[PDB]
């Protein structure tokens, strides 16, 4: 078979998509290589179709031996809602990067002028990442431009079709026969309408709307998850107060995929065929690495298989020694989650660690902590115009030193529900209803919880580990309180949320849908900052406050 060894060459960085498109050589090589692996036949193991067929459809083994190897559970190889999510989606990007750099290495020999620079550029070609937490609105070259300007083989700037917008099937795999819409669709569709038409213009607007919420979710996900169960999966874990890596991962899949109807990107069986997928999960891997800098010594714990993949049947106990199928290091040994702590083993890194390249684990944590405080944190007011926002900035951002200890309430919208109740991907919208419920207002929009579903299991060999998984999500309210109120007291924020008529709506496709396992509430956690620390701690004096009568359902 094909061993997942990663890209060749030295240890090179995965560049930001903002900077990757400005480098002519890297962008040209990326377009050429991507079109190269796209035009190959869908039966070849090194094609875009086979690599995308690992995350979902088809339900066939990838790179398997001629000799017999039965499949334990027929589903996609993707491992979602378990402890193996980040590591599996870590090596999964490495194989795609490996073959993509192989094709680009073949294309580099097809040039004529500067044959030494264009080949070395192919040796350093790493999959760029889309920093959704900072700039949710991406550049035009990856979602909006039908044609892109690159450099031809002779050295002239030419205009070619962009292979990043979409992917044409050739042909549509018969396994998609019984799946609606996906069988009739020629190419992948982002943000579809009721007439099966791709609506990219509305998608841009949406991202521009969800920029702030995505920023806060990314920040709190990176800084306030100290254990593996609270960081890697959907599962409702005790004493949680921030989104997990997988939830923030779901937000992008739901932004690009779910429009008036369900698209490719919002279905776990067809998500990998969208070329933007690899730009998202690259940044996800970056999020993992950043988290590794903040919490060293915290890695994969043991957990059960909740929904079931092709690697493990529902009920299998998974740990750091589990086999990350179908990714192998040698022809007789599959990858495990243990060696995946060092990205340098796979010949790639990220520019966030450029300033501390070769430092102690103590210093890397401080630099990355400060870097997250400045990149995704909350800035303070100009000239002290809003003191409440300065107090909010001390807890969720850059912390100015103080003589006395500071205290405030951290407010969040917690929502818990039982996945697999409905077999359609949906979303929960939160907004203020004081102005009116018939216009999408930039200021009166809180956030949303998107659901990234796909194939559901039904039963097993009358096993016993089969337990309903509970998925939870968070939406932050602190910045909206700092804009209006002058304090974070519960007695004031109750009147703030009741006067502004904080409401929510569970929507699937276009019409409204209802589920019975949902429980939404507002949580106020007393946070205090001693005069010598910048990291907030739970205030063990005043108890946690829960409001379950403020939210309103709208249909
Ligand atoms: Cu996935
Ligand atoms: Cu994904």
Residue numbers in the entry: 3 to 557
Sentences reproduced from the published study:
Tyrosinases form an ubiquitous family of metalloenzymes and are found in all domains of life. Tyrosinases catalyze the ortho-hydroxylation of monophenols to o-diphenols (monophenolase or cresolase activity, EC 1.14.18.1) as well as the subsequent two-electron oxidation to the respective o-quinones (diphenolase or catechol oxidase activity, EC 1.10.3.1), which is coupled with the reduction of molecular oxygen to water. Activation of molecular oxygen is affected by binding of dioxygen to the type III copper center in a characteristic ‘side-on’ bridging mode (µ-η2:η2). The purity of these preparations is further compromised by the fact that Agaricus bisporus possesses genes coding for six different tyrosinases (AbPPO1 - AbPPO6).
Herein, we describe such a protocol, yielding pure AbPPO4 in its latent form as well as providing access to the mature, active form of the enzyme. Here, the latent form of AbPPO4 is produced by E. coli at a yield of 110 to 140 mg per liter of culture. ESI-MS of the acidified (causes the loss of copper)27 but otherwise intact protein yielded a mass of 65096.7 ± 0.30 Da for the latent tyrosinase which matches the calculated mass of 65096.46 Da for the complete sequence from the N-terminal glycine at position −8 to the C-terminal threonine 565 with one thioether bridge (−2.016 Da) and one closed disulfide bridge (−2.016 Da). Latent tyrosinase crystallized in the monoclinic space group C 1 2 1 with 4 chains in the asymmetric unit giving rise to a unit cell of a = 287.30 Å, b = 52.09 Å, c = 152.66 Å, α = 90.00°, β = 98.03° and γ = 90.00°. The obtained crystals diffracted to a resolution of 3.25 Å (for further statistics see Table S2). In contrast to the crystals obtained with the enzyme isolated from the natural source which contained two different chains in the asymmetric unit (one latent and one active protein)33 and did only form in the presence of sodium hexatungstotellurate(VI) (Na6[TeW6O24] • 22 H2O, TEW), the recombinant enzyme formed crystals containing exclusively the latent tyrosinase. Inspection of the electron density gave no indication for any deviation from the sequence shown in Fig. 5. The amino acid side chains which form hydrogen bonds with the TEW polyoxyanion in the crystal of the enzyme purified from the natural source (HKKE starting at H116) are found in equivalent positions in the crystal of the recombinant enzyme but the lysine side chains are considerably more flexible as indicated by the lack of electron density beyond the Cβ-atoms.
